[PDB]
């Protein structure tokens, strides 16, 4: 026969075939444990990503709300005309700053919600 | 001791002609029959109620 010369070399011991049945060097429970550990440790990336996403989502809300509250304090406190004249430009700066933050958030959100497939 | 695994065991399927899209394209006729029959039943009931 063609392969009898090779298949004559394949004769094993009782202990050999017991060891193969148990799968000593082919199951590798240490490798299984390493996989489980690495897989559970890889859950940190989800937390990182959600943190980044929420910050980029609330950045415009902050620029619109908390700096707004600060401007509201200044408006409540100021009375004269010179300070008000000077403060109008701060308000306009806040307008431009809000639009800048909105642009930044748009950029990061199209980066974070872009999928290949 | 060599490769024990083939390539398709690792590599991702086709991007545009994949298993699910081929499957659902095959099941399209049966789903059309199902939902058309259900919609026709509902429509006939509502019409039988609304006409009189």
């Amino acid at each position: 026969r063609p392969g009898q010369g090779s298949n004559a070399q394949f004769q094993t011991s009782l202990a050999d075939k017991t060891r193969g049945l148990l799968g000593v060097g082919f199951l590798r429970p240490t490798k299984m444990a390493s996989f489980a550990a690495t897989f559970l440790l890889n859950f940190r990336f989800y937390f990182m990503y959600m943190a980044r996403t929420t910050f980029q989502a609330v950045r415009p809300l902050l620029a619109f709300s908390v700096f707004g509250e600060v401007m509201k304090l200044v408006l409540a406190t100021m009375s004269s005309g010179l300070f008000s004249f000077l403060f109008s430009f701060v308000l306009a700066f806040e307008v431009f700053y809000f639009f800048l933050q909105c642009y930044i958030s748009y950029t990061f959100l199209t980066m974070f919600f872009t999928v290949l497939f | 001791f060599g490769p024990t695994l083939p390539d398709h065991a690792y590599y991702g399927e086709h991007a545009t002609y994949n298993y699910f899209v081929l499957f659902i394209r095959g099941m399209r006729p049966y789903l059309e029959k199902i939902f058309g029959d259900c919609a026709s039943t509902i429509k006939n009931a509502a019409v039988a109620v609304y006409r009189p």
């Binding site: 082919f26 590798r28 299984m32 996989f35 489980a36 | 695994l5 083939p6 065991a9 049966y30």
Partner: protein
């Protein structure tokens, strides 16, 4: 041409289930030994056990008044020391004596030890579930103290 004469939709269902199961066996065979056994048996099994136990059994947070009343856990492994606030799952038929024995490891407990919940002492021939239902509804925090008085 949908359907064939002489064949049943139930026969087709059986066909489909056979196909799916054969494909699953093929994909499990041609897979990594390192990952598949874990991901298919050990995580599902642990998740099943945890979820079933939580959704079905009912548990209690146990505290002890004094460090002198703490159990001896030096010998048993994976817990060398008592910590208060331990979540303990019990059966509906459990009594205070059974709970006390479970805490103290089937060993000689101290004298005049009693259980309380929201300041209310339990009898030892009492069902823990009904006693909690009566005294501390939806606040199962139990406390073990010494009743000398």
């Amino acid at each position: 041409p949908l359907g064939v004469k002489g064949r049943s939709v139930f026969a087709g269902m059986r066909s489909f289930i056979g196909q799916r199961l054969g494909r699953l066996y093929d994909s499990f065979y041609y897979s990594q030994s390192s990952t598949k056994y874990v991901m298919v048996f050990l995580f599902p099994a642990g998740i099943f056990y945890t979820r079933f136990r939580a959704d079905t059994k009912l548990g209690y947070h146990v505290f002890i008044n004094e460090e002198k009343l703490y159990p001896d856990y030096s010998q048993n492994y994976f817990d060398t020391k008592w910590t208060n606030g331990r979540k303990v799952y019990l059966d509906d038929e459990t009594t205070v004596e059974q709970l006390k024995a479970q805490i103290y490891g089937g060993k000689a407990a101290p004298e005049n030890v009693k259980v309380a919940c929201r300041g209310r002492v339990f009898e030892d021939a009492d069902n823990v579930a009904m006693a909690v239902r009566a005294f501390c509804k939806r606040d199962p925090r139990l406390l073990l103290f010494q009743d000398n008085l």
